[PDB]
Amino acid sequence: PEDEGIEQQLDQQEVLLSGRYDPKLYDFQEGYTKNPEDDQTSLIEKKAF
Amino acid sequence: SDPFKKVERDYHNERSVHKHFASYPLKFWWGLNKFETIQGIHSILGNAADLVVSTLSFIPGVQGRNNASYIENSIRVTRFRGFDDKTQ
Amino acid sequence: MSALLKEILALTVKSEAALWKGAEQKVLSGLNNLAKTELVQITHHFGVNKQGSEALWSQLDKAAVGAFPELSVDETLQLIDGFGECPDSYTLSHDLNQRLLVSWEQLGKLNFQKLKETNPYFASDIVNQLDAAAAEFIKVRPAAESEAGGFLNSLGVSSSFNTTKNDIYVVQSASGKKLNNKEQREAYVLEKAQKYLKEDPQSKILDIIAQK
Amino acid sequence: AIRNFVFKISNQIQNLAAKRSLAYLNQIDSQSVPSRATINMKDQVTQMQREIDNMANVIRAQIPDEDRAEFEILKKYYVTGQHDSLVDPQDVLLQLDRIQVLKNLKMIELNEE
Amino acid sequence: QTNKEWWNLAKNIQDVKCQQELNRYNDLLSQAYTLSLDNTIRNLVFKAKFYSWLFVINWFKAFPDDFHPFIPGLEMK
Amino acid sequence: MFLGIFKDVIKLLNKKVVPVYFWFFLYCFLSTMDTNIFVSSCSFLKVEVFGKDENTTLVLLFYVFYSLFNFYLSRIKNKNNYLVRKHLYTTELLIELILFKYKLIILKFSSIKYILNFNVRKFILFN
Amino acid sequence: NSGNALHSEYGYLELLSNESVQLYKDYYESDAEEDFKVFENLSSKEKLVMIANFENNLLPKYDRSEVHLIPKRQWEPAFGVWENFLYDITEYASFIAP
Amino acid sequence: MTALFLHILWSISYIIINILYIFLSLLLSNNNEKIKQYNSNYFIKILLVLFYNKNLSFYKNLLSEDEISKIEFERLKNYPTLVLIHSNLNKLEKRNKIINSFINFKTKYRFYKFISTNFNLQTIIKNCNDKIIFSTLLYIVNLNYSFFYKTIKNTDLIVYLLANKFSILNDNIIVSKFNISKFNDYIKYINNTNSIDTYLEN
Ligand SMILES: CCCCCCCCCCCCCCCCCC(=O)OC[C@H](COP(=O)([O-])OCC(O)COP(=O)([O-])OC[C@@H](COC(=O)CCCCCCCCCCCCCCCCC)OC(=O)CCCCCCCCCCCCCCCCC)OC(=O)CCCCCCCCCCCCCCCCC
Ligand SMILES: CCCCCCCCCCCCCCCCCC(=O)OC[C@H](COP(=O)([O-])OCC(O)COP(=O)([O-])OC[C@@H](COC(=O)CCCCCCCCCCCCCCCCC)OC(=O)CCCCCCCCCCCCCCCCC)OC(=O)CCCCCCCCCCCCCCCCC
Ligand SMILES: CCCCCCCCCCCCCCCCCC(=O)OC[C@H](COP(=O)([O-])OCC(O)COP(=O)([O-])OC[C@@H](COC(=O)CCCCCCCCCCCCCCCCC)OC(=O)CCCCCCCCCCCCCCCCC)OC(=O)CCCCCCCCCCCCCCCCC
Ligand SMILES: CCCCCCCCCCCCCCCCCC(=O)OC[C@H](COP(=O)([O-])OCC(O)COP(=O)([O-])OC[C@@H](COC(=O)CCCCCCCCCCCCCCCCC)OC(=O)CCCCCCCCCCCCCCCCC)OC(=O)CCCCCCCCCCCCCCCCC
Ligand SMILES: CCCCCCCCCCCCCCCCCC(=O)OC[C@H](COP(=O)([O-])OCC(O)COP(=O)([O-])OC[C@@H](COC(=O)CCCCCCCCCCCCCCCCC)OC(=O)CCCCCCCCCCCCCCCCC)OC(=O)CCCCCCCCCCCCCCCCC
Ligand SMILES: CCCCCCCCCCCCCCCCCC(=O)OC[C@H](COP(=O)([O-])OCC[N+](C)(C)C)OC(=O)CCCCCCCCCCCCCCCCC
Ligand SMILES: CCCCCCCCCCCCCCCC(=O)OC[C@H](COP(=O)(O)O)OC(=O)CCCCCCCCCCCCCCC
Ligand SMILES: [K+]
């Protein structure tokens, strides 16, 4: 059937399980700041992320 | 009555006191014409009243406003023009 | 006086035919001797016990009418209760029923006025409770009209108090007990309607419920 | 042709309206944007109602006890009796006058004691 | 680090558990800055300077209503 | 149906919907002071009452008489009976006064800035 | 009939926020570096953040898009342009629209 | 004066519609039976809800009792200003029919006994004699629900109200009335209504 809803769920797993977006490989930072600073988001927002 | 005496000019009468203390608290609302909102309200009421007169003008002895006349438009429009509460 | 009242109390409790006849004769003879308070008490006692000759009750009706102006609220209530639980063959003359009817209405009107003044939300609370489970057509009723006169009634026009009647009633128990469901409420209403119909066969409660 | 096209416009409009009105119930939209907007609206509403109550509480604490009864009557009427037709304002006025009678009596006692 | 006036307002404010909800009361809690002083000429001059400077310094702060470090809130309550 | 419309027009002009006071006001508004029957004949009204730029004495006397009469009527009405529904206009005035009294209390014990912020938020929520 | 939500539609939303927090606890149950006390007494913003990641796993996973048939009113030549137009208008407001 | 302004504009609209109604009737089939067939139309109902009153000849005999009641119900439910206009027009009826009740003391007391036996009046009013509460309740009903006396018996109506009120619970209850269409009522309504209480049946 290649259902739209199911395929979207499958491709999401394929992208996330690809290993290219592993949080271990990234040093999250604000970016917009002049100086390099780590993520400043709230504790709940980090858990939600 | 005798309006002729009132018409008659008199040195004392002209320079006498015409407006007394009691009239000030009763006539101070006329200063609200300064506000644009009050001017807008009065213009709307005047326009509404003119419309009623025009619709009821069919009866004899009652004539509504005619937009052609310049005097009627000028007086109705320039009533609040240049209003200044500071200058007597 | 006190002994006679106690004797009437004892005889009424015994509920013996001869004792009732003896009490009826004694009270009938001593109606004038007894004061208003005693007359009211014996009338109340006879009514609750469901006994008394027609002649005795008829003379009690005359006594109550004559001494009605000197009655207090408690005296009026006792007379109403006694004349309510009176023997069936006691068709009263058309002076006491009017007095009882007028007195009862006045007591209700005065009580309503006193309660409303003490708490202005008294009337509103009752009306909301009555209309909480009422049918839609019941809520459709108009609003109260101003009966006051003056410029607004003679030379002016007074706008009516009616407004949109699309409201939602949220009922919450003050104590916190669980409330009845729709099926339970329908059963409760149906049971009450059946009881009222049995008492009064001509009642149209069935149609009223069936309407909505 | 024309009739079908008109319906197609109607179909898209009706879908748009249904989404715009009831999108907070489902999770079709990622991150539940409409659901969080609806929750925010209720939180603002409840906070505003609670803020009015808190403002009354602080005034109630600071109000002198002599006129605290009057404040209660005014507070209760402003919340409930204002929007109820069955609540006659005359009775509320009568309560205020009864309080004023007691104040007048106290005032006159002090003047002529 | 607060005063009695703020505590009186804070205790009266009840049933609030969120900082965002309490921030809605920031203006009410600002009344705690009584800054009581007489209106003598010297004080009147000081008031004009102090409040004008207070307006300018707040401009350089440019903090939003959300972040109010000098207005005590839920944590102290 | 022409009769039906005529009856409807009469009903729509009925006293209970269009006050006679409105008609009297309309007649005065449309007619001049010399054509108005109610005042053209009466020289006192046309000169002594409405003809003076300042009639404080007569105005004061009229107000005093009206005040005493209405105070007497209100006292008599209250003494006789009070469980009578009052007019909507009078009820609304009393409601506004009670609300105004409460609003003064809020303003007295609350800051202007807090009032402005609260009202702005309430208006935004309403929109 | 309106964009506002009713009372029965808010209890469901409250459960979603509670469910989202519980879902996080269940998944990260076996993680030492996790303190669940922070989830007690969340702020309004914090609750909204959790609601964002809420997921309902009992819903069907297939697309719910489908086609529904609404029978039409064939043009009636016996009536005319205006009469048919009025018939279409009333039909649309009475049957097709609802 | 606002009500007068609304009434006059409504009156002008009403007259214009009737003139159109007459012109259409004379031009078209001109049969009342044919006209009555469209009273269920979507737009015709709106027109009736907009310009129908019992004191006017518009659709005087073209509507049945059920149709008239529905039109009145719809207007009273979702049309604030129209209700204001039509409520004012209803003053022209001047019915002012006041009718007493419970003429006979025997019947009145018997009705009181039935209510007392089948219901607990202490819930409605606290710390008051049952007879006084009964008299007070009758006065309340007469002031409020006397409109139905034209068709509904007073005793039946009182029993129906009592039965429904006690159906919810045989104990003191608190009732809150809200009009969700209004902003202030809606905010209070959602604030006061809690899902936990509804689930617990409180
Ligand atoms: C239920 C009831 C029953 C009752 C029963 C009983 C009844 C009894 C009988 C009673 C009868 C009563 C009848 C009478 C009642 C009605 C009276 C009436 O009509 O009055 C309304 C009257 C009507 O106004 P108007 O004169 O017709 O308006 C003119 C038009 O605007 C014309 O304006 P303009 O274009 O010619 O020039 C100004 C220009 C606007 O251009 C400007 O910006 C003007 C700036 C001027 C200088 C500002 C200096 C500010 C610094 C401080 C002061 C410095 C000293 C010098 C001050 C000079 C005076 C300004 O205006 C605009 O075009 C604006 C757009 C208009 C639409 C928006 C309307 C908004 C409100 C109007 C005021 C707006 C002010 C904005 C200011 C700027 C904000 C960025 O309204 C006002 O008085 C204004 C609004 C109310 C203001 C309240 C202020 C309270 C104090 C605030 C203190 C804290 C803040 C102070 C700082 C300022 C804010 C930052
Ligand atoms: C007629 C000429 C008109 C034109 C010229 C006008 C004047 C020049 C322009 C000045 C403009 C800038 C303002 C400068 C003055 C500021 C003073 C100030 O802030 O004092 C704060 C002082 C302390 O207030 P707070 O700290 O907030 O708390 C006080 C509580 O009461 C708590 O207090 P407490 O319960 O503990 O009791 C103590 C309280 C007790 O206070 C009372 O209420 C007691 C009242 C006793 C009788 C008052 C009359 C006697 C004093 C007259 C003033 C001096 C002569 C003025 C005329 C000069 C030309 C001939 O005493 C005080 O706290 C200290 C009061 C001393 C300050 C006022 C004295 C100076 C005012 C005159 C202007 C200064 C420049 C004059 C230059 C020429 C001569 C050197 O507040 C006041 O008392 C202010 C009251 C209102 C003042 C209005 C303006 C002065 C009027 C004077 C009478 C003139 C005749 C009336 C017609 C005027 C034309 C419409
Ligand atoms: C109307 C008649 C005339 C005026 C009458 C008098 C005034 C009446 C109305 C106002 C009455 C209230 C008076 C103020 C009472 C005190 C308020 C208060 O508690 O505020 C204190 C405020 C507390 O707030 P917060 O905790 O920061 O929370 C911030 C939130 O934003 C919360 O912020 P907020 O909302 O609380 O903000 C406070 C703001 C509240 O007040 C206001 O917002 C002002 C309201 C009135 C003025 C409105 C003007 C609006 C303008 C736009 C409209 C159009 C105007 C058109 C003009 C045309 C003609 C020019 O306070 C003020 O600034 C009061 C100023 C009062 C004077 C007003 C006149 C100023 C005239 C200036 C003229 C221009 C300059 C000179 C001339 C230039 C050209 C030659 O700050 C302090 O406690 C200060 C502490 C001192 C140390 C500061 C250190 C800063 C540097 C370090 C930062 C980093 C911190 C460390 C790290 C982080 C933490 C670990
Ligand atoms: C630049 C200017 C500034 C403004 C901006 C620009 C504005 C542009 C607007 C353009 C609008 C375009 C409209 C096109 C519609 C096409 C309809 C269609 O599908 O055609 C086929 C349709 C074919 O008919 P059918 O559907 O098969 O039915 C025929 C069956 O044989 C017969 O079927 P049945 O017998 O079974 O039943 C139907 C029969 C049943 O009988 C009826 O129901 C007859 C009713 C007659 C009217 C009764 C009221 C009398 C009082 C006067 C009007 C007051 C207004 C209230 C109207 C109430 C509703 C009628 O009725 C008929 O015969 C229907 C046709 C009626 C035509 C005669 C009336 C035309 C004039 C209407 C009033 C116009 C407004 C005047 C405003 C005041 C001017 C001083 O064509 C027609 O037969 C009628 C076509 C009409 C075209 C109108 C074009 C007007 C363009 C100029 C507009 C400006 C007017 C002046 C005002 C200026 C203001 C600024
Ligand atoms: C626009 C059309 C004009 C056409 C002119 C044609 C010439 C003849 C006109 C006929 C009307 C006047 C004479 C007869 C009146 C009969 C009154 C009567 O017995 O009714 C009992 C009526 C019974 O009340 P209700 O029905 O139970 O309703 C209760 C509501 O509470 C009561 O209120 P409501 O909601 O029912 O509506 C009235 C509401 C006002 O309603 C309106 O807006 C009226 C709108 C116009 C109505 C037009 C109706 C007449 C139409 C005739 C023309 C038909 C022509 C037909 C032919 C075809 C035309 C195409 O009036 C008030 O209560 C206002 C009081 C406060 C003063 C407001 C003005 C100052 C502003 C103050 C602001 C304060 C804010 C706070 C402080 C601010 C500080 C900065 O009693 C009153 O409403 C008493 C009103 C007392 C105040 C009136 C005077 C104040 C100004 C009124 C508004 C402006 C209009 C003034 C006249 C304009 C003439 C050009
Ligand atoms: C035609 C007339 C036009 C008049 C326009 C005048 C505009 C004047 C504008 C001055 C702005 C000054 C800003 C700096 C801060 C001032 C102090 C301050 O913040 O106030 C609060 C301060 C602080 O008072 P507070 O401490 O009670 O504050 C209460 C608030 N809490 C509780 C938070 C503290 O108030 C005062 O000290 C008194 C202010 C009023 C003083 C009046 C003096 C006389 C004025 C005469 C008229 C104006 C001058 C002449 C104009 C001539 C024009 C031709
Ligand atoms: C003994 C009673 C004699 C009169 C009996 C019939 C009177 C009927 C008419 C009422 C009086 C109208 C006077 C109009 C002319 C006039 O006033 O003339 C004096 C001035 C004229 O104003 P202008 O100079 O702007 O033309 O009036 C005013 O300043 C306004 C006063 C109010 C006038 C209208 C009446 C309002 C209600 C009066 C009671 C409320 C308090 C009044 C102040 C104490
Ligand atoms: K919705």
- 3-state class (DSSP) for residue F108: helix
Residue to probe by mutation, ligand 2, list E35, E36, E40, most atoms within 8 Å of CB: E40
Q: What is d(CA D88, CA C125) in angstroms, rounded to the nearest whole number?
A: 13
Q: What is d(CA E12, CA H191) in angstroms, rounded to the nearest whole number?
A: 21
Q: What does the DSSP assignment read for H13-77? A: HHHHHHHHHHHHHHHS---HHHHHTTTTSHHHHHHHHHH--TTS-TTSSSS-HHHHHHHHHHHHH
Closest-CA residue to C98 (of H103, H17, H46, H44): H103
Report DSSP state, residue A38.
Answer: B
- 3-state class (DSSP) for residue C172: strand
Contact flag G56-D27 (C-beta cutoff 8 Å): yes
H38 vs G contacts (CB less than 8 Å): none
Contact flag F35-B61 (C-beta cutoff 8 Å): yes
Residue to probe by mutation, ligand 5, list H1, H2, H8, H14, most atoms within 8 Å of CB: H1
Name residues whose C-beta falls within 8 Å of residue H174's C-beta, 6 or more positions apart in sequence: C171, C172, C173, C174
Q: What is d(CA C126, CA H174) in angstroms, rounded to the nearest whole number?
A: 10
Region of C146 (left: φ > 0; alpha: ψ -120 to 50; beta: rest) is beta
Q: What is d(CA C121, CA F84) in angstroms, rounded to the nearest whole number?
A: 17
Q: Whose CA is nearest to atom 20 of ligand 2?
A: E40
Q: What is d(CA F33, CA F47) in angstroms, rounded to the nearest whole number?
A: 11
H199 near G CB under 8 A:
yes
Helix axes D89-112, F88-109, angle to 10 degrees: 60
Chain centroid offset of residue C59 CA = 24
Report DSSP state, residue C179.
Answer: P
F15 vs C contacts (CB less than 8 Å): 157
**R_g of chain G, CA atoms, integer Å:** 25
**Residue H4 is which amino acid?**
L
E-strand stretches of chain C: 168-173
Q: How far is the CA of G83 from the centre of ligand 4 (A)?
A: 13
Q: How far is the CA of H201 from the centre of ligand 2 (A)?
A: 69
H/E element, H177:
strand H173-178
Closest-CA residue to C96 (of C116, C125, C67): C67
A25 near G CB under 8 A:
no
Q: Is F28 annotated as a binding residue?
A: no
Contact flag H199-G11 (C-beta cutoff 8 Å): yes
Q: What does the DSSP assignment read for B21-40? A: TTHHHHHGGGGGGGSHHHHH
Q: What is d(CA E29, CA H192) in angstroms, rounded to the nearest whole number?
A: 27
H35 near F CB under 8 A:
no
Give start and end residues of each alpha helix (H) in D1-113: 2-22, 33-62, 68-76, 89-112
Chain centroid offset of residue A45 CA = 13
Q: How far apart are the first and last CA of chain F?
A: 47
- Please answer whether residues A24 and G80 qualify as being in contact, where contact means their C-beta atoms are separated by less than 8 angstroms: no
Q: What is d(CA H168, CA H202) in angstroms, rounded to the nearest whole number?
A: 11
Q: What is d(CA E25, CA E40) in angstroms, rounded to the nearest whole number?
A: 32
Closest-CA residue to E16 (of E8, E24, E5): E24
Q: What is d(CA C53, CA C24) in angstroms, rounded to the nearest whole number?
A: 7
Structure determined via: cryo-EM
D85 near H CB under 8 A:
no
Residue B36 tokens, joined: 């644009």
Q: Whose CA is nearest to atom 57 of ligand 5?
A: B52
Q: CA quadruple G7, G13, G17, G18: dihedral positive or negative?
A: positive
Helix axes C96-118, C73-84, angle to 10 degrees: 130
Phi, psi (rounded to 5 degrees) for E17: -120, -5
Q: How far is the CA of F26 from the centre of ligand 5 (A)?
A: 14
For tokens 């409409």, the residue is D34
Chain centroid offset of residue H148 CA = 9
Using CB atoms within 10 A of its CB, is residue C118 exposed (0-12), middle (13-18) or buried (19+)?
A: exposed
Nearest to F21 among C155, C158, C159 (CB): C155
Q: How far apart are the first and last CA of chain E?
A: 11
Query: Nearest C-alpha of chain E: how many angstroms from G43?
Result: 5
CB atoms within 10 A of CB H148: 19
Name residues whose C-beta falls within 8 Å of residue A28's C-beta, 6 or more positions apart in sequence: A38, A39
Q: Whose CA is nearest to atom 6 of ligand 1?
A: F93
Q: Is F31 annotated as a binding residue?
A: no
Q: How far is the CA of D24 from the centre of ligand 8 (A)?
A: 8
D49 vs H contacts (CB less than 8 Å): 187-188, 191
Q: Strands C168-173, H173-178: parallel, antiparallel or unpaired by DSSP?
A: antiparallel
CB atoms within 10 A of CB B24: 9
Q: Dihedral through CA C47, CA C49, CA C51, CA C55, nearest 10?
A: -30
- Please answer whether residues G52 and D36 qualify as being in contact, where contact means their C-beta atoms are separated by less than 8 angstroms: yes
- Please answer whether residues G56 and G17 qualify as being in contact, where contact means their C-beta atoms are separated by less than 8 angstroms: no
Q: Which residue of F has its CA nearest to E34?
A: F111
Q: Dihedral through CA H105, CA H109, CA H112, CA H113, nearest 10?
A: -170
Nearest to F86 among C113, C146, C155 (CB): C146
**R_g of chain H, CA atoms, integer Å:** 23
Residues 162-201 of H with CB under 8 A from D: 184-185, 187-188, 190-191
**Residue A6 is which amino acid?**
I
- 3-state class (DSSP) for residue H173: strand
Q: What is d(CA G27, CA G35) in angstroms, rounded to the nearest whole number?
A: 13
Resolution rounded to one decimal, in angstroms: 2.9
Between the alpha carbon of residue C130 and those of residues B74, C33, D41, H98, H160, the distances in Å are: 63, 49, 33, 22, 9
Query: Using CB atoms, which chains have 3+ pairs under 8 A with E?
Result: D, F, G
- Please answer whether residues D43 and E16 qualify as being in contact, where contact means their C-beta atoms are separated by less than 8 angstroms: no
Q: Whose CA is nearest to atom 55 of ligand 5?
A: B52
- 3-state class (DSSP) for residue G91: helix
Between the alpha carbon of residue E57 and those of residues B31, E2, E36, E61, F100, the distances in Å are: 42, 21, 21, 6, 39
Q: Whose CA is nearest to atom 19 of ligand 3?
A: E30
H/E element, F20:
helix F20-30
Name residues whose C-beta falls within 8 Å of residue H168's C-beta, 6 or more positions apart in sequence: C132, C133, C171, C179, C180, C185
Residue C67 tokens, joined: 């001494």
Contact flag F56-B53 (C-beta cutoff 8 Å): no
Give start and end residues of each alpha helix (H) in H128-193: 130-145, 154-168, 183-192
E18 vs G contacts (CB less than 8 Å): 43-44
How many Cα atoms are found within 13 Å in the side-chain-facing hemisphere of B82?
2
Contact flag C157-F18 (C-beta cutoff 8 Å): yes
**Residue B61 is which amino acid?**
G
